[PDB]
Amino acid sequence: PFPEGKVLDDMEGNQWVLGKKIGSFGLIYLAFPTNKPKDARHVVKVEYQENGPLFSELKFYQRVAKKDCIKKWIERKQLDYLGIPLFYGSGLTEFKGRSYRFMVMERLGIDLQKISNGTFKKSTVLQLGIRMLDVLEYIHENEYVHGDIKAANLLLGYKNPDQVYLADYGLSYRYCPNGNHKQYQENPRKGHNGTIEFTSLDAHKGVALSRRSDVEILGYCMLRWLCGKLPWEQNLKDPVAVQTAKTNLLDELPQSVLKWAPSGSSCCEIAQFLVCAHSLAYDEKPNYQALKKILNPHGIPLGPLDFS
Numbered sequence: 001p002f003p004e005g006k007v008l009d010d011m012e013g014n015q016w017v018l019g020k021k022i023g024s025f026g027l028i029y030l031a032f033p034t035n036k037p038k039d040a041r042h043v044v045k046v047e048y049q050e051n052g053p054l055f056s057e058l059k060f061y062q063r064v065a066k067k068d069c070i071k072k073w074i075e076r077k078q079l080d081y082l083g084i085p086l087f088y089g090s091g092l093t094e095f096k097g098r099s100y101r102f103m104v105m106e107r108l109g110i111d112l113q114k115i116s117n118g119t120f121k122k123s124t125v126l127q128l129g130i131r132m133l134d135v136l137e138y139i140h141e142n143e144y145v146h147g148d149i150k151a152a153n154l155l156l157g158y159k160n161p162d163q164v165y166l167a168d169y170g171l172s173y174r175y176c177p178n179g180n181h182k183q184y185q186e187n188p189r190k191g192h193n194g195t196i197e198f199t200s201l202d203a204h205k206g207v208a209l210s211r212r213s214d215v216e217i218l219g220y221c222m223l224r225w226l227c228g229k230l231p232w233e234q235n236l237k238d239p240v241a242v243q244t245a246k247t248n249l250l251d252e253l254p255q256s257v258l259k260w261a262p263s264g265s266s267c268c269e270i271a272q273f274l275v276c277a278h279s280l281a282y283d284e285k286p287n288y289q290a291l292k293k294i295l296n297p298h299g300i301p302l303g304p305l306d307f308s
């Protein structure tokens, strides 16, 4: 890999020093700015090899993760925070005989899969959804969809673990380049992509991801976080079976969702959400404010995330 203490030059002038390799479509290191540098509050993602998939993810961060754009959006929407990892820059570095691409990103805490089976308090499941909706509205406005929401790609902040961040934009897609929404085409060859437990129906058919697909995956997530299981989990080996089960579930809403819930818990809000989500056309803009009203109907403001 790359040795500790290596100095990297971003394309905005800045210099960064590598830290410990904290695991790994690219390698992840802790990062320190040389200027006004204690504990690492930055992270570096470095390309695995020549001509890799970093480009996709790199493009997204450069295009939409800039702090300027975010701070402006937060003011316009009156939001407390927006769960996108801050992007500090990217550049080129030479290891051995060739150049490599690296990203510099805000440091984050632990992911949700590690925290909790995977069952959280209902209050928490709903808040996670509401937070994810804000992130989705913003990225969707910027012509991009995530495509892989799951517990593993939601991370708490390092400095503030009260706040949560959607991570891992590798499988992200530009659905609306330059205001031109993609056409609908089913492709069996480019089919069943993403995490099978939560991938959208459009993904099962090889249709290019559009905004609704993100909303659908979130609904699946929230159901799994609340119930601890999904109907299709028994037969993940057959992706087609999974598509069938997802179709069935949505075809028979809301009882299908309601029946799934374990005694003593309710999936009422989640069932409505999937109802609202499954109503959408391929090119339709989700009603983010209605979806958020669904997950927090009373209108009491959100409290701190609870992982007790």
Ligand SMILES: Nc1ncc(-c2ccc(S(N)(=O)=O)cc2)cc1-c1cc(F)c(O)c(F)c1
Pocket (backbone or CB within 6 Å): 022, 023, 024, 026, 028, 043, 045, 085, 105, 106, 107, 108, 109, 110, 166, 167, 168, 169
């Ligand atoms: N921004 C981040 N901050 C912290 C970690 C991290 C924390 C703890 C641990 S660990 N094993 O618990 O020590 C490992 C990694 C990872 C990312 C991150 C890496 C990527 F490659 C992404 O694409 C991405 F969106 C996010």
